């Protein structure tokens, strides 16, 4: 029982110890392509890189590297693509991957500037009259509409392949108040954001993997993937007791290093799943209570 374990770690104060065991048992696979010289300026941070066995390959001839990782959960039947914050020179790469892997949703859990520094390039247009044209990957990106909530923003983006003239709709889910190495204001404000992504159909298996990124793509990103997956197992197995959060996190660290960055991010992951477990079991009123407590209307 997660609650019996959760209560047990809060009374023992061993959250920094449980998390430090996870970093110890975490997988360690070669990042040969990442640490190549030609891909130095494609890596935002030096301690964050994709495993060669799970990295996303770009379908071009020149240089196929982009700091992105396919995380596939076979049992849970869902895949995610986690990636760093696009650098000013890999923005075309970022959208080239989105197209090739046939993705419909992007989830951005950081701001372009946080704590006085630049954590991410402005890889999407802010005004409908100002569309972005990436000439390196021959793409065009245009802003269609945006619904601005208090702590998150849902944009609607049209991406066009200039070579073939195909166009696709891309939903952009921007969580704006999740600080680096911090946690959401409340589990309700997080879950209300997760389900807003679910109902949009971006996570549907008829589409590609969803793209989830923050600044490095492991801290806030893994927390979002860890909660969704765990909830997903809990509706399939129908046996919530069987869901071990510590194991599921270790499974994801096979596909991308450093998933979850702080011990309290791990703590929040428990609370998020414990609260979200109420909807999986059938509670229909908790769908709106999250909406009310999140205070999105503003």
């Amino acid at each position: 029982e997660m609650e019996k374990e959760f209560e047990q770690i809060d009374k023992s104060g061993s959250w920094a110890a449980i998390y430090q065991d996870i970093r110890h048992e975490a997988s360690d696979f070669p990042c040969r392509v990442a640490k190549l010289p030609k891909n130095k300026n494609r890596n935002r941070y030096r301690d964050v890189s994709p495993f060669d066995h799970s990295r996303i390959k770009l379908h071009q001839e020149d240089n196929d590297y982009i700091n992105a990782s396919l995380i596939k959960m076979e049992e849970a039947q869902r895949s995610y693509i986690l990636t760093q914050g696009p650098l000013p020179n890999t923005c075309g790469h970022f959208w080239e991957m989105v197209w090739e892997q046939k993705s419909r949703g992007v989830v951005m859990l950081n701001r372009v500037m946080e704590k006085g520094s630049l954590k991410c390039a402005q890889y999407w247009p802010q005004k409908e009259e100002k569309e972005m044209i990436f000439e390196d990957t021959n793409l065009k990106l245009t802003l269609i509409s945006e619904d601005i909530k208090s702590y998150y923003t849902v944009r609607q983006l049209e991406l066009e392949n200039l070579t073939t003239q195909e166009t696709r709709e891309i939903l952009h889910f921007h969580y704006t108040t999740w600080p680096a190495f911090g946690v959401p204001e409340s589990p309700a404000s997080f879950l209300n954001f997760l389900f807003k992504v679910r109902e949009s159909g971006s996570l549907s298996p008829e589409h590609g993997p969803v793209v989830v990124h923050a600044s490095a793509g492991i801290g806030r990103s893994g927390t979002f993937c860890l909660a969704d997956t765990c909830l997903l197992l809990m509706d399939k197995r129908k046996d919530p007791s069987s869901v071990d959060i510590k194991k599921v996190l270790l499974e994801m660290r096979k596909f991308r290093m450093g998933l979850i960055a702080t011990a309290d991010q791990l703590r929040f992951s428990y609370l998020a799943v414990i609260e979200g477990a109420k909807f999986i079991m059938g509670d229909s009123s908790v769908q709106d209570q999250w909406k009310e407590l999140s205070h999105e209307d503003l």
Partner: peptide, 4 residues
């Protein structure tokens, strides 16, 4: 730069 370094993430940690």
């Amino acid at each position: 730069e370094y993430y940690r």
